[PDB]
Structures are given as C-alpha cells and as structure tokens.
C-alpha cells in the first residue's frame, strides 16, 4: 500500500508538494535561543528536553499560498513527537494535507531519502521542495531546491521561490520545465 491515502475531492486536480521540515521552513535547536518562535517540549529516553524553534521568514505567505495551489504533504526525516507539535503551530490554514515521517522515509546509504514513487502520485504531478539533494536522490528532476535555513533573518528564498510555483501549479507535467 501506498504513503497517502487517495487525494479529496478538491485536491486531485492539483500537483502534489511534499515539503521538508527542517532547514526548509523552520530551524530547531537543543541549544537555548532567545526569540523563538515557538518551543516544543520533546522526550528523549524518558527525559523532556526543551526544542527552540525558528520560523524562516515569510513562511506564513508561502503556506498560505502553496496550500491554495497544490496538494501539499508534510515529508520530514524528524519524528512525528518533534514534528507534528511543530506542523500543529505553523500549519494555520490546513495547507498540509498529510504527514510524513521518519518511517516513511528509506535510509539509504547514511541519509534519509524521501522516496516519490511510494506517495501513490503520478510523478508528473509530484514536486518536492528541499534543502538538501541527499533528500531525493531518487527523483531529482522532481526537485525544487532551497537554500538550508537557520537563522538568517533577511532570507527571502520562500517569498522569491512563490512566482516560480505559481508556473507549475498550472503546467500538466511538470519534468516539461524541471526538464
Ligand atoms: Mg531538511
């Protein structure tokens, strides 16, 4: 059985995003940080230990905006106790359709790949936004890339990246402009 269940209604028609979590939209850290966003207290081996979370900037407008335009997915490498609280709080508008963690994805080769062809998608109308190539070995015409995120606040690669997804919302095949 495929990683998602069969698209809603209002969601078939559009091109499927999965999107990455850490160095894409946010930055985490056991480190202690002064403005943060949001903290997620997460157990590690019965202990809580505080996570500091930054938001990348303008990622409120991107998924905003890509919630409208795609079928988005949430596909991270973290697991869901960290994760999910973090897609809880910065997830407003019920733009991630789904959630996809550290077992869905296949660890090959010392890095975490997130495998396309077991979302249950057509690869023509599968995107993915990431940080690091590693992340889709498998399917690198499918890729988006994106600078890795931490703590640059004058970072606008999410807001520039927006025209660029507003183009494939709309193509039919989208290796016709990742050729
Ligand atoms: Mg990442």
């Keep these: ?71 988005c997915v949430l596909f991270t490498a973290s697991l869901a106790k960290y994760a999910d609280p973090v897609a809880d709080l910065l997830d407003k508008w019920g733009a991630f359709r789904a959630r996809l963690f550290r077992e869905s994805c296949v660890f090959h080769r010392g890095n975490y790949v997130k495998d396309l062809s077991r979302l249950g998608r057509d690869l023509r109308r599968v995107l993915i936004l990431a940080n690091s190539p590693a992340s889709y070995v498998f399917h690198p015409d499918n890729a988006v890339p994106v600078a890795s995120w931490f703590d640059n606040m004058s970072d606008t690669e999410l807001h520039d990246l927006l025209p660029f997804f507003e183009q494939l919302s709309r193509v039919d095949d989208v290796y016709s402009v990742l050729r």
Aim: aromatic content about 8%.
């Design 1 to 71: 059985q495929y990683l998602l269940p069969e698209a809603k209604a209002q969601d078939s028609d559009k091109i499927c995003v999965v999107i990455d979590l850490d160095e894409t939209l946010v930055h985490s850290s056991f480190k202690p940080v002064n403005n943060a966003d949001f903290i997620i207290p997460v157990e590690i081996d019965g202990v809580v230990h505080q996570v500091y979370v930054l938001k990348r900037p303008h990622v409120d407008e991107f998924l905003q905006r890509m919630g409208e335009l795609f079928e």
